Amino acid sequence: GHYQAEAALLQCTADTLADAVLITTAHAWQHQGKTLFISRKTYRIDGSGQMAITVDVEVASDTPHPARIGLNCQLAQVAERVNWLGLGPQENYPDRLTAACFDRWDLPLSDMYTPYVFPSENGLRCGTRELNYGPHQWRGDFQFNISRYSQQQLMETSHRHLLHAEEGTWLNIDGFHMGIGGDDSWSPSVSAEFQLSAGRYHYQLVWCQK
Amino acid sequence: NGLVFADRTPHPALTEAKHQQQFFQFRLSGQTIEVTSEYLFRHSDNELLHWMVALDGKPLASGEVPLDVAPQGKQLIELPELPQPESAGQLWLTVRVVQPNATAWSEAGHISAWQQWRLAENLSVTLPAASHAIPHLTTSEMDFCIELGNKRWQFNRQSGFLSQMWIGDKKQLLTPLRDQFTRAPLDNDIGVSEATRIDPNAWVERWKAAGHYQAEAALLQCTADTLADAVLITTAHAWQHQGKTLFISRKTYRIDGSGQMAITVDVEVASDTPHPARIGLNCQLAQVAERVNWLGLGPQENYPDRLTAACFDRWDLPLSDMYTPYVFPSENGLRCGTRELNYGPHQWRGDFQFNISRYSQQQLMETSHRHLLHAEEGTWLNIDGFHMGIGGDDSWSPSVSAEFQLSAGRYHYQLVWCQK
């Protein structure tokens, strides 16, 4: 039920500190009475203009290891360029990133999507400490992809030529992402060390304007 | 270099050897246990299999089946349908091979093999009932104090550490709660087979030269806030040697109305410093209790690269059994994969490794022989989010495998301290 799990709110509170507002949330993801994932977050917005997102995730040990652990949203802004400090410049995944180099990369938005004829998750970059897109900047230690196509459209469309740019830009920011495998393509092939099996996961992100 | 002491008392290593050298191998598929014999000649004619299902140490079902396995052969053991657990938590399956009859070499009831698996886990989605009391913050020049009835928390604003805790009038700590990144070096960390030959490549020497052992905490941030139902202490420290920052510890302490102190720790390790022996906290407790009770890996001493023999369960031992008397003293007595620890009035919860004893890491590394060790006042506790492997492929060069070195650069753990 990973694809049809629904977020059930467990907690949502606000607090006022000396220099910041602090939002605390908790969600459970559930399918047919079973809790798959729990996400606990803090959003700390301070006087500088920065939002610090702290995420801790629990994953039931008896559910198949999830493909990713991160956040996504659809930004209204469409910009020409994507600028990042992390692995690149090309698409790289945790078990296919040895060729990528850590540096400051800057590509047109289109180069951030890989036109696989049969569409799937694509264009991820790993080891990213900073991502700039229009007026937005994200900082932390994460993996991301950014494009005009939702994960939903990608999995529903059988051929690349049938895809249509959605309004604005879909961003996927992952603390953690599963390997892609490939030793063969007809049996599970992602090695154990690249499966998200640690049960508890922590990542932090800082969102701001430049 | 023995698996047993001179008087033939086992070192902790012995049990790891027993487990890896088992003659029965096990696989689980759904509810079926597959038993494979590694015997070449004998049938399993003095063996029965005990199984036991438990939820966080609480037994929920058990049974026996005799083993009837030809040499090199297999046996399938279908478990009965198991009663579903009411409460949250992780179910664990344990199996043991027991020899019912005495032999020339063993006594009746001798356990020759064991294995564990996680079964179903039910994550907790229930919010604990909103506590009645609210903690109060007292801001002085020297301290951030926190009160909740009889209980008190004191955070020294100059050190940035929790210097003292009170229950009524009784003091709880003899030494403040501080980050620790070093361990009393093991024989494998020292890495010599000859007395005069120094190896600058050995873990202990790389650590010493980097200043790990004499790095001092420098306060970068100590702040307090009042929340709707809690007090939040936020600290940030930097450990430095000869102008070089080795680690940075960012923490939040959260004390709520129920009297629980939640510690969230985020550590930065400079990539060009030798990987640290441990990422944890320590303190000297005032108390001296007879028993140590924990939910985690045990019962014996176990380390990240020597923990396969340990079983996750509820263990209760006399405190002295939580110290391993290695003739040449070092870091010892660690237990891994621990979710709950109970000592006197204290309970710590999270997902951590710990050791507990009357001996500080400082004394252990300064004393050459076990007979020269002296029990100190109170109990030293080391609680680690992460601990480096012990190695041993040999004892005269670095032997700790890469997957067991603390090289991630950024580390996160969380502890909850309370009274039960």
Ligand SMILES: O[C@@H]1[C@H](O)[C@@H](O)OC[C@@H]1O
């Ligand atoms: O080769 C090892 C070492 O070099 C020597 O000094 O101690 C004995 C061991 O075999």
Ligand SMILES: O[C@@H]1[C@H](O)[C@@H](O)OC[C@@H]1O
């Ligand atoms: O504790 C270690 C050992 O006991 C000593 O002989 O060499 C370096 C280090 O101090």
Ligand code: NA
């Ligand atoms: Na598709």
Ligand code: NA
């Ligand atoms: Na038998």
Ligand code: NA
């Ligand atoms: Na010593």
